[PDB]
Protein backbone atom coordinates (compact mmCIF):
# COMPACT_ATOMS: atom_id res chain seq x y z
CA UNK A 1 0.00 0.00 0.00
CA UNK A 2 1.47 3.33 -1.17
CA UNK A 3 -1.49 5.64 -0.57
CA UNK A 4 -4.73 5.64 1.39
CA UNK A 5 -6.39 5.18 -1.99
CA UNK A 6 -4.52 1.90 -2.75
CA UNK A 7 -6.22 0.24 0.22
CA UNK A 8 -9.55 1.84 -0.63
CA UNK A 9 -9.44 0.45 -4.18
CA UNK A 10 -8.49 -2.96 -2.79
CA UNK A 11 -11.43 -3.04 -0.38
CA UNK A 12 -13.78 -2.01 -3.19
CA UNK A 13 -12.44 -4.95 -5.22
CA UNK A 14 -13.02 -7.26 -2.25
CA UNK A 15 -16.63 -6.05 -2.01
CA UNK A 16 -17.10 -6.86 -5.71
CA UNK A 17 -15.42 -10.27 -5.82
CA UNK A 18 -16.33 -11.42 -2.28
CA UNK A 19 -13.38 -13.74 -1.59
CA UNK A 20 -13.59 -16.15 1.34
CA UNK A 21 -10.59 -14.46 3.06
CA UNK A 22 -11.93 -10.87 3.15
CA UNK A 23 -12.77 -9.34 6.52
CA UNK A 24 -14.43 -6.46 4.63
CA UNK A 25 -17.07 -8.79 3.13
CA UNK A 26 -18.36 -10.05 6.49
CA UNK A 27 -18.17 -6.52 7.92
CA UNK A 28 -20.13 -5.02 4.99
CA UNK A 29 -22.76 -7.78 5.25
CA UNK A 30 -22.92 -7.25 9.04
CA UNK A 31 -24.33 -3.71 9.27
CA UNK A 32 -23.27 -0.21 10.29
CA UNK A 33 -23.76 -0.55 14.06
CA UNK A 34 -21.03 -3.17 14.41
CA UNK A 35 -18.69 -1.06 12.23
CA UNK A 36 -19.15 2.02 14.43
CA UNK A 37 -18.44 -0.09 17.50
CA UNK A 38 -15.26 -1.48 15.94
CA UNK A 39 -14.09 1.99 14.96
CA UNK A 40 -14.62 3.28 18.50
CA UNK A 41 -12.76 0.27 19.97
CA UNK A 42 -9.84 0.98 17.66
CA UNK A 43 -9.77 4.66 18.62
CA UNK A 44 -9.38 3.50 22.24
CA UNK A 45 -6.58 1.11 21.24
CA UNK A 46 -4.88 3.98 19.39
CA UNK A 47 -5.08 6.21 22.47
CA UNK A 48 -3.61 3.46 24.69
CA UNK A 49 -0.78 2.88 22.21
CA UNK A 50 -0.10 6.62 21.78
CA UNK A 51 0.28 7.03 25.55
CA UNK A 52 2.05 3.82 26.47
CA UNK A 53 3.33 1.71 23.57
CA UNK A 54 6.06 1.61 20.93
CA UNK A 55 6.00 3.48 17.63
CA UNK A 56 5.40 0.14 15.90
CA UNK A 57 2.46 -0.75 18.15
CA UNK A 58 0.94 2.67 17.53
CA UNK A 59 1.42 2.33 13.77
CA UNK A 60 -0.35 -1.04 13.94
CA UNK A 61 -3.38 0.34 15.76
CA UNK A 62 -3.54 3.41 13.51
CA UNK A 63 -3.46 1.16 10.45
CA UNK A 64 -6.48 -0.72 11.85
CA UNK A 65 -8.33 2.53 12.61
CA UNK A 66 -7.75 3.61 9.00
CA UNK A 67 -8.91 0.22 7.73
CA UNK A 68 -12.19 0.33 9.68
CA UNK A 69 -12.77 3.94 8.62
CA UNK A 70 -12.57 2.78 4.98
CA UNK A 71 -14.93 -0.14 5.59
CA UNK A 72 -17.41 2.32 7.12
CA UNK A 73 -17.06 4.63 4.09
CA UNK A 74 -17.83 1.71 1.77
CA UNK A 75 -20.79 0.60 3.94
CA UNK A 76 -22.39 4.04 3.64
CA UNK A 77 -21.45 4.57 -0.03
CA UNK A 78 -18.88 7.34 0.42
CA UNK A 79 -16.07 7.93 -2.08
CA UNK A 80 -12.54 9.11 -1.28
CA UNK A 81 -13.48 12.41 -2.97
CA UNK A 82 -16.46 12.83 -0.61
CA UNK A 83 -14.02 12.86 2.32
CA UNK A 84 -11.04 14.53 0.65
CA UNK A 85 -13.11 17.55 -0.44
CA UNK A 86 -13.44 18.42 3.27
CA UNK A 87 -9.70 18.39 4.07
CA UNK B 1 -10.74 -19.64 -7.79
CA UNK B 2 -10.38 -22.52 -10.27
CA UNK B 3 -8.84 -25.19 -8.03
CA UNK B 4 -8.43 -25.88 -4.33
CA UNK B 5 -4.80 -24.94 -4.90
CA UNK B 6 -5.65 -21.40 -6.18
CA UNK B 7 -7.13 -20.52 -2.79
CA UNK B 8 -4.28 -22.25 -0.96
CA UNK B 9 -1.68 -20.18 -2.84
CA UNK B 10 -3.69 -17.03 -2.12
CA UNK B 11 -3.83 -17.71 1.62
CA UNK B 12 -0.08 -18.41 1.65
CA UNK B 13 0.42 -15.00 -0.02
CA UNK B 14 -1.80 -13.38 2.61
CA UNK B 15 0.31 -14.96 5.37
CA UNK B 16 3.45 -13.50 3.75
CA UNK B 17 2.19 -9.99 3.03
CA UNK B 18 -0.18 -9.64 6.02
CA UNK B 19 -2.73 -7.23 4.54
CA UNK B 20 -5.15 -5.46 6.87
CA UNK B 21 -8.16 -7.15 5.18
CA UNK B 22 -7.07 -10.80 5.59
CA UNK B 23 -9.08 -13.04 7.91
CA UNK B 24 -6.30 -15.64 7.57
CA UNK B 25 -3.75 -13.33 9.24
CA UNK B 26 -5.74 -12.88 12.45
CA UNK B 27 -6.65 -16.58 12.44
CA UNK B 28 -3.01 -17.67 12.00
CA UNK B 29 -1.89 -15.28 14.77
CA UNK B 30 -4.74 -16.55 16.99
CA UNK B 31 -3.72 -20.19 17.55
CA UNK B 32 -4.83 -23.70 16.62
CA UNK B 33 -7.55 -24.14 19.27
CA UNK B 34 -9.73 -21.39 17.82
CA UNK B 35 -9.21 -22.81 14.30
CA UNK B 36 -10.38 -26.28 15.34
CA UNK B 37 -13.44 -24.75 16.97
CA UNK B 38 -14.26 -22.78 13.82
CA UNK B 39 -13.86 -25.87 11.65
CA UNK B 40 -16.21 -27.86 13.88
CA UNK B 41 -18.79 -25.02 13.85
CA UNK B 42 -18.66 -24.99 10.06
CA UNK B 43 -19.10 -28.76 9.84
CA UNK B 44 -22.31 -28.29 11.87
CA UNK B 45 -23.45 -25.49 9.53
CA UNK B 46 -22.73 -27.77 6.55
CA UNK B 47 -24.83 -30.57 8.07
CA UNK B 48 -27.75 -28.16 8.73
CA UNK B 49 -27.55 -26.85 5.17
CA UNK B 50 -27.26 -30.35 3.66
CA UNK B 51 -30.43 -31.44 5.46
CA UNK B 52 -32.54 -28.32 5.22
CA UNK B 53 -31.23 -25.56 2.93
CA UNK B 54 -30.79 -24.69 -0.74
CA UNK B 55 -27.97 -25.88 -2.97
CA UNK B 56 -26.56 -22.34 -2.85
CA UNK B 57 -26.65 -22.19 0.95
CA UNK B 58 -24.91 -25.57 1.13
CA UNK B 59 -22.26 -24.46 -1.37
CA UNK B 60 -21.66 -21.37 0.78
CA UNK B 61 -21.13 -23.37 3.97
CA UNK B 62 -18.95 -25.94 2.20
CA UNK B 63 -16.80 -23.14 0.79
CA UNK B 64 -16.27 -21.88 4.36
CA UNK B 65 -15.43 -25.37 5.63
CA UNK B 66 -12.82 -25.67 2.87
CA UNK B 67 -11.44 -22.22 3.70
CA UNK B 68 -11.00 -23.03 7.41
CA UNK B 69 -9.46 -26.40 6.55
CA UNK B 70 -6.81 -24.54 4.50
CA UNK B 71 -6.15 -22.04 7.29
CA UNK B 72 -5.62 -24.98 9.66
CA UNK B 73 -3.21 -26.62 7.18
CA UNK B 74 -1.20 -23.39 7.00
CA UNK B 75 -1.23 -23.01 10.82
CA UNK B 76 0.31 -26.47 11.24
CA UNK B 77 2.70 -26.18 8.27
CA UNK B 78 1.05 -28.73 5.97
CA UNK B 79 1.39 -28.54 2.17
CA UNK B 80 -1.26 -29.51 -0.38
CA UNK B 81 0.96 -32.50 -1.26
CA UNK B 82 0.94 -33.65 2.38
CA UNK B 83 -2.85 -34.02 2.15
CA UNK B 84 -3.17 -35.02 -1.50
CA UNK B 85 -0.77 -37.97 -1.08
CA UNK B 86 -3.41 -39.57 1.16
CA UNK B 87 -6.31 -39.33 -1.32
Elucidation method? X-ray
Name the architecture of domain A1-87: Orthogonal Bundle (1.10)
Closest CA to B23 of A71, A5, A66, A19: A19
CB within 8 Å: A67 and B20: yes
CB within 8 Å: B64 and A19: no
- Nearest by CB to A14, which of B21, B26, B64? B21
Sequence-ordered list of residues with C-beta below 8 angstroms from that of A63, at least 6 positions apart, any chain: B20
Sequence-ordered list of residues with C-beta below 8 angstroms from that of A80, at least 6 positions apart, any chain: A4, A5, A8, A73
Closest CA to B45 of B66, B71, B72: B66
Hey, which residues 32-71 in chain A have their CB within 8 Å of chain B? 63-64, 67
DSSP E strands in chain B: the ranges are none
How far are the Cα atoms of A16, A57, A81 from residue A85, in angstroms, in the given order? 25, 30, 6
φ and ψ at B22, to 5 degrees? -85, 115
Count Cβ atoms below 10 Å from residue B9 Cβ, excluding itself: 13
Helix ranges (DSSP H) in A1-87: 4-17, 23-30, 32-52, 55-76, 80-84
Q: Three-class SS of residue B57? A: helix
Sequence-ordered list of residues with C-beta below 8 angstroms from that of B72, at least 6 positions apart, any chain: B32, B35, B36, B39
Mutation for B interface: A21, A22, A24, A39, most B CBs within 10 A:
A21
Class of residue B63 by CB neighbours under 10 A (exposed 0-12, middle 13-18, buried 19+): middle
Distance CA A12, CA A17 (A): 9
Domains of chain B by residue range: 1-87
Q: Three-class SS of residue A54? A: coil
Amino acid sequence: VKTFEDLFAELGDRARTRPADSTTVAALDGGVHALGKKLLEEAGEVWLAAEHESNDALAEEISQLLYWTQVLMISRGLSLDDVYRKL
